[PDB]
Amino acid sequence: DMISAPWEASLTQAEHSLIFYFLALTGSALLFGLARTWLTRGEVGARYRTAVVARSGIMIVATLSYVFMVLAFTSGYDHVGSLWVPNSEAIMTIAPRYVEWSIAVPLLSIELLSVATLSGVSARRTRLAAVAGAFLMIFTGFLGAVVIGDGRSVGSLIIWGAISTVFWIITAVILIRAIRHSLPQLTPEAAALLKTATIFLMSGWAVYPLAYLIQILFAGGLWTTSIHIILCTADIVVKLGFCGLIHRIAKLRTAEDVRA
Amino acid sequence: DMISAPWEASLTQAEHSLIFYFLALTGSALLFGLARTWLTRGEVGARYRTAVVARSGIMIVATLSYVFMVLAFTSGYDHVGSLWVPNSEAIMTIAPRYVEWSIAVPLLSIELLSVATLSGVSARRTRLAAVAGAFLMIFTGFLGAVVIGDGRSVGSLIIWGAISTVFWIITAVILIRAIRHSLPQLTPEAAALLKTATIFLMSGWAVYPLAYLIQILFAGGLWTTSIHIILCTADIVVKLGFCGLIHRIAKLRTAEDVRA
Amino acid sequence: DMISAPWEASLTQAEHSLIFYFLALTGSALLFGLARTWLTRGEVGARYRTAVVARSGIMIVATLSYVFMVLAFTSGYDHVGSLWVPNSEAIMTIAPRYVEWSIAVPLLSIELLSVATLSGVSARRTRLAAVAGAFLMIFTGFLGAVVIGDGRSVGSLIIWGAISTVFWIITAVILIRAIRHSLPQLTPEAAALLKTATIFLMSGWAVYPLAYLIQILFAGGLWTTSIHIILCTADIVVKLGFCGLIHRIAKLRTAEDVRA
Amino acid sequence: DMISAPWEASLTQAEHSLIFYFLALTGSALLFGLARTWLTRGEVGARYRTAVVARSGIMIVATLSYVFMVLAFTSGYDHVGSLWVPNSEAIMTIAPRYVEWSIAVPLLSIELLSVATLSGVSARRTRLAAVAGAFLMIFTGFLGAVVIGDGRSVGSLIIWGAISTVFWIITAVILIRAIRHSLPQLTPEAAALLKTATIFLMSGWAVYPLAYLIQILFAGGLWTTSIHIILCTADIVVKLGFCGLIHRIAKLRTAEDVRA
Amino acid sequence: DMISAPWEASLTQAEHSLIFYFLALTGSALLFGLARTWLTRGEVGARYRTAVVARSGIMIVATLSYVFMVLAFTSGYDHVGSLWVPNSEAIMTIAPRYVEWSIAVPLLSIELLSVATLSGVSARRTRLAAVAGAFLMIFTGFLGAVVIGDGRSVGSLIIWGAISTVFWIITAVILIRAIRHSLPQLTPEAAALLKTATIFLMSGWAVYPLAYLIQILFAGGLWTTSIHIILCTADIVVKLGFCGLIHRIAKLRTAEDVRA
Ligand SMILES: *C/C=C(C)/C=C/C=C(C)/C=C/C1=C(C)CCCC1(C)C
Ligand SMILES: *C/C=C(C)/C=C/C=C(C)/C=C/C1=C(C)CCCC1(C)C
Ligand SMILES: *C/C=C(C)/C=C/C=C(C)/C=C/C1=C(C)CCCC1(C)C
Ligand SMILES: *C/C=C(C)/C=C/C=C(C)/C=C/C1=C(C)CCCC1(C)C
Ligand SMILES: *C/C=C(C)/C=C/C=C(C)/C=C/C1=C(C)CCCC1(C)C
C-alpha cells in the first residue's frame, strides 16, 4: 500500500509548538551532556579513555544533528492559515536523525565495551562486529524509512524494517555475549553496574523501532508529533542516562585499578 | 475568554528597541557568565564539581536560547509604517525561554543540592524529585502559555498556571526541606550562605509567575515589552547572582575540607 | 526640535566602505584581544583573577557586538544608485553598541578595582556603586539616543544626555576616590601604573560623549561615518589599551606578592 | 567529446536523500575524528607531535569542507516536480572537496613521514617533495575536473587526469622510498605497522581516481550519487582509519623511546 | 584617467572557480595554521610568548577575513548566462583583506621583534613605530584602492600608492635597523635564522604591491582572478612560512636560555 510520509503532514500550531520544544530541548540537553563530558574527563583513567572519546563523539554528533533539525524545522514548514504546511525542507527535520544514529549507535557499542573486560582478538572481533552490525541496523532503517519509496511505501518499510531488525539482533547478541563473558572478571559492584548499563542500552534500542511502526501504520500530524516526541525523548534518556552510567562504571574501574 | 497572545502584538519602534536591548543584554551577560565559570572552575574541589557542571550547563543552554531569540526577534517582526508587526516567527521570540527553563530550573536545583550535605538514598531521592518537579513546573507552564489554546485562551492559562504552581510547591518544599536538614551539618559561615542561596533561588522563582499573570490579564505591545524586560532581567539576576553565590559556598566548602 | 537619526542617513559608497572597515577592524582587534587574554592568563595570580575574568568578559561581549554590527551593516543598507540607503535593520548597526557598553563599562570598573587595594565593606560597596553607576550611565544614554523619540528628538537627547552625564560623574568619583585611597598602599611602581590606568580609563570615557554631541548637533552621512570611526577607534584604544595596562599592573602585583 | 558535469544532473528524491546522508555522515565522522584527536593528543611524545598537528589539520579542514558542502547541497538543488534540479550553487557541492584534498593530501604525507625515521636534508627534501607532489596531484585534478572546460569536456579531463596521475606517481614513489629506508631502523612491531600504514594510504589514494573515471565516462543522477558515496566513504575510511593507525605507530614509538 | 574596479568585472565560470578555490584554500590553510599554533604553544618560553600571541592573532584575524570573503564571494556574484556578474556585495570579496592586513602587518612586525634582542626605550620605541608604520601602510592603501574614487580612479590609486609606499619604507627601515642591531647579540644559529626571517618578511611585503599595480594598470576578469590568486598565495606563504620560522627561532632561543 502507500502511507503518507511523516514529513508530508501539515501540523497544527500546537503540534508545531510541541515539535519545536522537543527538538530544542533535546539539542540543549545534548549540549549540556557535551559540557558535562569535558568537565569530568579527568575522573577516568587512560585505560578507559575510549569511554571519554565515545561519549564525546556521541554528544558532538547528536548536538549538531539537533541544531540542524531545529534550523530545518524553522525553515521547513510554512504557515498557511491555521496550519503549518510542510515545505520541501521538511524531510530535513527527520532525516538528520539517521545521520546521528549512524555514528552514535556504533559508538554506544564501543562505549559499553570499553568498561567491559576484553582483550586481543576477542576484543577487536567483538568491536568490529558491534560497530558493523549497529551501522547497518541504522542504514537499512534509513533506506526503508526515507530513501526507498520516499518513505511513502508500506511494502518498503516492512522489508527494511525486517532487515534492520535482523542486524539489531546480530548486534545485540554480540554485545550481550561479551558483557556476560566480562561480568565474572569484574568486581561485584562494577559487574552490577555493567549489567544495568547493558539492560538500559538494549531497552533504549527497543523504543526507537516503535517510532518506525507509527510510520508504517499511522499517518497524520499527531503522528508526526508523536514520532518527534518519542525519538527526542529516547535520545535524551539514552544518550544522557547511559553515557552517565558508563562513566560511573569507568570511574569505579579507574579507582579499583589504583587500589592495586 | 480569549486574550491575544504575547507574540501577536505589534510593537512601537521604542518597544522594538527596548525588547532587543534586553534580549541582547541577557544573552551577553549569560555569555560572560559562561566565561567566568570556565576561568574559575579550578577554585572548586572535585567533591563539588557538580556545581561547576550545573553552572556551565545553565549558562550554555541560556546563552543559546537568547541567541536564538535575538535572531528570531530580528526576523520575526516586519516594519509596517510606524509599528513592527509580528510575523509567524514571532512566537520563536518567547517560546525558546521555556526550552531554556526546562534544562535550567532542574540544574539550578541540582546546583543548590551540590553544596548542601546529603548522601545515599536521601540524596538520590531528593535530586530526582527536584529535577522531576522542576521540569514539570516548566513544561506545564509551556502547555498553558504556548501550546494549548495558542496562548490566546484565558481558561487554558489558568488551568495550567495552577498545575504549574502545584509542581512549583512540590519542588520548592523538597529543596527547602533538604537545605534545612543540611544547614546543621555545615560550618556557620557556609550555612549562612546556603540559607541566603535558598532564599534567593526561591525568591527568583517567584518573579517568573508574575509574567504569566500579565499574559492572562493584560495584552498589548507595552505588555509584550514588560514580559521581556521582566523575564530577561530575572534571568540575568537569578542565573548570574545565584550561580555566583553557590560557587562562593562551594569554594568555602572546598577550603574547609582542605583544612581537615 | 528634531534631527534625523544617525541610522537614517544614506551613505556614499566611500562612507559605506569606511564604515565597514572600522566595524570589521574593531571586531578583529577585539578578537585578538580575546586570544591574547586567554594565552596570557597564567601570568596573573588567583588574587587578581577578577582581572582575567573581567578582561575576558569585555572582549567576548565586544567581539559579538561587532560581529552582529558587521552583519547588520551588511544587511541594513541597500544600494540605490550611487548611495546606500538605510533599511529598517540599519538601527542594528549602532544600537548593539549600547548592549556591549552596558556589560563592558561595568566590567572595566571591576577590572580597575581588582588591581587596586580594597577590602571588606569598602570593596563591596565601591564595586556595587561603580557597577550600578556605570550601567545607568549607559542605559540612560541608550534611552535618549535610541529608544525615546526614536533618536530623532533633540529635546530627548539633551535630557538623557544630562541624566547620563550625572551617572558618569557619580561613577567617576567613586572609582577616582577608591584609586586615590588605594595608591598609598601599593608599591611606587604599581601605584604609578594604577594612576595611569585611572587617567586612561576616565579619558577614554570622555571621548564617547563626543559622539552623542554629533547626534545632537549634526546630521548626515559624513556624521554617521564620523560616529562610527570615533566610537570604533575609542573601543579599540580603550578596550585593548586599558585592559593591557591592568594586566601589567596585575602581573606586577602578582610578583610582588611572590617576593613575600 | 562532451559530457554533462557531475553537478548538472537532476537528482531523484532518493538520490537527493542518499547524497545528503553521506555528506552529513562524513562531516559528522570527521568531527568525531577531530574530537578523538584532541582528547588523545597526550599519548604522543613531542618528537612525534607533528603527527598530532597533521591529524588535527586534516580533520579541521575536512570538517569545514563537509559542512560547506552540506549547506551548499541544501541550497544548491531546487525541487521541481519529482526531481531536484541543480541550481548554480550545485558546483559548490563537489568543488569544495578539492580545497580539502589540497591541504589534506599534503598533510597525510607529512603525518606518514612523522612516524618514519628520517633526518637532516633527507627529511626536509622528502617532505617538500611529498607536499609539493601531493598538492599538484590535487590541483591538476581540480583544473581538469572543474576549472578547465567547466567539467564538461572529456578531452580536458583526460589531459589533466594524466598530469594528475604523473604527480601521483612521483609523490607515491617518494613516500614509498622513504618508508622502505625507514623500515630497517624501526622496531619490528613499529615497522610492521608502518608497512601497513603505507599500504593503506596508497590504497586509499587509488580509490579517488575511480570517481574521476566516472566523470569522464558516465553521466547522470545515479553517477552523481555514486561519486558522492564513493568519495565520502573514501574520506571516512582513509582519514579516520589511517590517522588512527599513525597514532598507534606514534604511541608505540613514544613508549619505545621512554624505555631507552 | 579611470579604470574599472577589481570587483566590477564579470567573471567567467573558470575564473569564478579559480577565485573560490584560492579563497577557500587560503582560509583552510590559515585555520590549520591556527591549530598548529595552539598545539605547539608549549615549545616556546614565557620570554617569547609574544610570538605565540602574535601568531595566534594573525591566524585568527586572517581566518575570519577569509571566511567572510568566501561567503561574500558566494553571495556577491550572480550567474547571468555564461558569466558571473558582480552584485553590490562583490566589493566585500576584496575589501576584507585590508581589514585583515591592518591587524596582521602590525602583528608580523611585533612577532619579528619578539625573537630579536631589544630592551627598554629602544624596544618600546621600535615596536610603536613599526606598528604605527605598518598600520598606515595598509590604511593608506585601503583609501587609494577602495575608499577614494571607489577604486576606479587611477589618479587616486597613484597618490595613495605612493603614500602607502612611503610608510612601507619607514616601517621596513625600522624593522631592518632593529634586526641588524639584534643580530650580534644572538647565537650564530639564531642570528642566521633571524636574518632569513627578516628577508622573508620583507620579500613577502614586496609581492602585495604588485597586486595594486594590476589594479592601476590592468582591468578585467582575468585580472580580478590574478589579484586573488596572487594575494591569496602570498598570504598562505607569508603567514604560514614566516610564522613557522619565528617559532623555530623562538624555540631555539628558549632552549639556549634553558642551557644557561
Ligand atoms: C542515540 C540514539 C540511539 C541509541 C538510536 C538507536 C536506534 C535504533 C536502535 C534503531 C533501530 C531500528 C530498528 C532495529 C528497526 C526499525 C528501524 C530502526 C533504525 C529505528
Ligand atoms: C534561569 C531561569 C529560571 C530560574 C526560571 C524559572 C522559572 C519558573 C520558576 C517558572 C514558574 C512558573 C510557574 C510556577 C507558574 C506559571 C508558569 C511558570 C513556568 C512561569
Ligand atoms: C568599551 C566601551 C566603553 C569604555 C564605553 C564607554 C562609554 C561611555 C562612558 C559613555 C558615556 C555617555 C555619556 C556619559 C553621555 C552621553 C551618552 C553616553 C552613553 C555615550
Ligand atoms: C582525505 C582525502 C584524500 C586522501 C584524498 C586523496 C585524493 C587523491 C589521491 C586524488 C587523486 C586524483 C588522481 C591521481 C587522478 C585525477 C583525480 C584525483 C585528483 C582524484
Ligand atoms: C598577512 C598579510 C600581509 C603580510 C600583508 C602585507 C601587505 C602589504 C605589505 C601591503 C603593501 C602595500 C603597499 C606598500 C603599496 C600599496 C599597496 C599595499 C597597501 C598593498
Numbering used by the authors:
A (entry chain B), B (entry chain C), C (entry chain D), D (entry chain A), E (entry chain E): 3 to 262
Paper text:
Here, we describe a rhodopsin group found in microorganisms from cold environments, such as glaciers, denoted as CryoRhodopsins (CryoRs).
In contrast to many known MRs, the pH-dependent spectral shift of CryoR1 is not observed in a continuous movement across the spectral range but rather in a gradual decrease of the red-shifted absorption maximum at 620 nm associated with a rise of the blue-shifted absorption maximum at 540 to 550 nm and the deprotonated RSB band (400 nm).
